[PDB]
Design a protein around this ligand. Sequence first.
Ligand SMILES: O=C(O)C(=O)Nc1ccc(I)cc1C(=O)O
Length: 297
Amino acid sequence: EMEKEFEQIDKSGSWAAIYQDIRHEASDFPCRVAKLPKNKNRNRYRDVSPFDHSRIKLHQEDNDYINASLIKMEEAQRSYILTQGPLPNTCGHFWEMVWEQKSRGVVMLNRVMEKGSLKCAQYWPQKEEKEMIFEDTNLKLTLISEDIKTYYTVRQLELENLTTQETREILHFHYTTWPDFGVPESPASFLNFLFKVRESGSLSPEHGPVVVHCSAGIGRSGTFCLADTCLLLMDKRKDPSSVDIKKVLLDMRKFRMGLIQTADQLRFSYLAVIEGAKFIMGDSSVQDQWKELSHED
Ligand SMILES: O=C(O)C(=O)Nc1ccc(I)cc1C(=O)O
């Protein structure tokens, strides 16, 4: 039980040390393409790069690079694409990747503006009449509708491949109250949002992998995915005591660096998994309790 491990860590005030231990054990793989000179302007942050082995390749001939990684969780049987907040020059590449990878959902965990800076480009239309067209990747993107709640918004988007006029619906789940280098307001609010994503069908294996991003695609995005995958794991076996959260985080950091950026985000990951376990283990009524606690209307 992770609840015994939690109270133990807490009692001894040792989150920072557990977390430094993860940082020390985590995988180091090359990111040579990330670092090619040509790719300088495709990366938001110097120190955050996809590993070559798990990077997503764009299906184009000029330059196939995007700062994005495939997190493939074999045991759990869920994949995610984690990526940085698109740059003003990489929005067509971002949509190219959603198209090629056949993703149904985009989970955005940041605002465009955070801590006085622009953390991400405005890569989707904010209104129905004003579509976006990405001339470089030959894609149009239209806002079809939005559902604005208190701390998150769900949008439906239409993505058209202008080369073919094939058309797809993309759901965008936008968490707007999760601070950079911070944590959600509560396990309930986080879990309510996670369950909104899950309910939508976006995480399903009939789709390509969900695209998850924050500003760098590591802190908030790693926290989201850790909690999801830990709950999925518990689900398949109905055996919570068999889930080792630090170990599943280390499995995830094989596919992208720096997943989970603070010790408090780690601590929050345990809280969300311990609470979520209630639902996985048969108490379906918690779901509506989280919705109520979350104050989403
Ligand atoms: O958005 C996030 O949650 C996240 O992980 N962000 C970051 C991670 C690493 C670095 I270098 C910078 C940031 C940042 O946003 O400034």
